[PDB]
Amino acid sequence: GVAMPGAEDDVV
């Protein structure tokens, strides 16, 4: 699934 706004660069 696509990341939530702001969380797209979280490592896992």
């Epitope: 699934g1 939530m4 702001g6 969380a7 797209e8 660069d9 979280d10």
Partner: antibody, heavy 117, light 110 residues
């Protein structure tokens, strides 16, 4: 052991500013985004803002029309919410919350902000 | 960009199964993950379910999540409900913005 420790709340007059801090530790601070979420009994949980793992991308929610801005200091491993032009309706418990791509994996302890003359 | 509607409250009985719903107003519930948070009186939220149906280790296996597409709703099911499960439960999803349901207060008699 993930720890998110908030400070800086209390009572503030309308039209004045306040800056909340969220001191993080117990995980690699720079590998994860962070968000601020507020709570009231009548409006529930409202997302205010998020900032990305590298501190370079920010996202604001429509519940506050840009009066609050989010920042971080990765060397102090601390996140901040700068709350300007405060209004009575901003009274709430403010949480910071760590993200893990698709959900909020840990929440701070919350701090109360009361906007009142 | 959408709202998530939760009942205000459910009252159930020790040992029962209870289902807490979270209905998405527009767009498919299945189009992004739904998560569930438990919040006790006076305390911070903690994760019950994330990524629709995954359970953090440490959360009792009587909690489970599912997605019901026919009612466009996510469901938190608690089997063998216990009085320590009294809490407010919030669902969470997202698309272009981040959305919380309004929270359901669970009361356990018996």
């Amino acid at each position: 052991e993930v720890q998110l420790v908030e400070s800086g709340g209390g009572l503030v007059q309308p039209g004045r500013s306040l800056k909340l801090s969220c001191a993080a530790s117990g995980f690699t601070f720079s590998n994860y985004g962070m968000a601020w979420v507020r709570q009231t009994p009548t409006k529930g949980l409202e997302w205010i803002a998020s900032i990305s793992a590298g501190g370079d991308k920010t996202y604001y929610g429509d519940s506050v029309k840009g009066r609050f801005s989010i920042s971080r200091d990765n060397a102090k491993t601390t996140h901040y919410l700068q709350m300007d032009s405060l209004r009575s309706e901003d009274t709430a418990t403010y949480y910071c919350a760590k993200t893990s791509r698709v959900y909020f994996d840990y929440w701070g302890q919350g701090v109360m902000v009361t906007v009142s003359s | 960009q959408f709202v998530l509607t939760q009942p205000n409250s459910v009252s159930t009985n020790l040992g029962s199964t209870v289902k807490l719903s979270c209905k998405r107003s527009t767009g498919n519930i299945g189009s992004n993950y739904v998560n569930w948070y438990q919040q006790h009186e006076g305390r911070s939220p903690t994760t019950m379910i994330y990524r629709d149906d995954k359970r953090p280790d440490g959360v009792p296996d009587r909690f489970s999540g599912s997605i019901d597409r026919s009612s466009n709703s996510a469901l938190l099911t608690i089997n063998n409900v216990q009085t320590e499960d009294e809490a407010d439960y919030f669902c969470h999803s997202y698309s272009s913005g981040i959305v919380f349901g309004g929270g359901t207060k669970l009361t356990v008699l018996g």
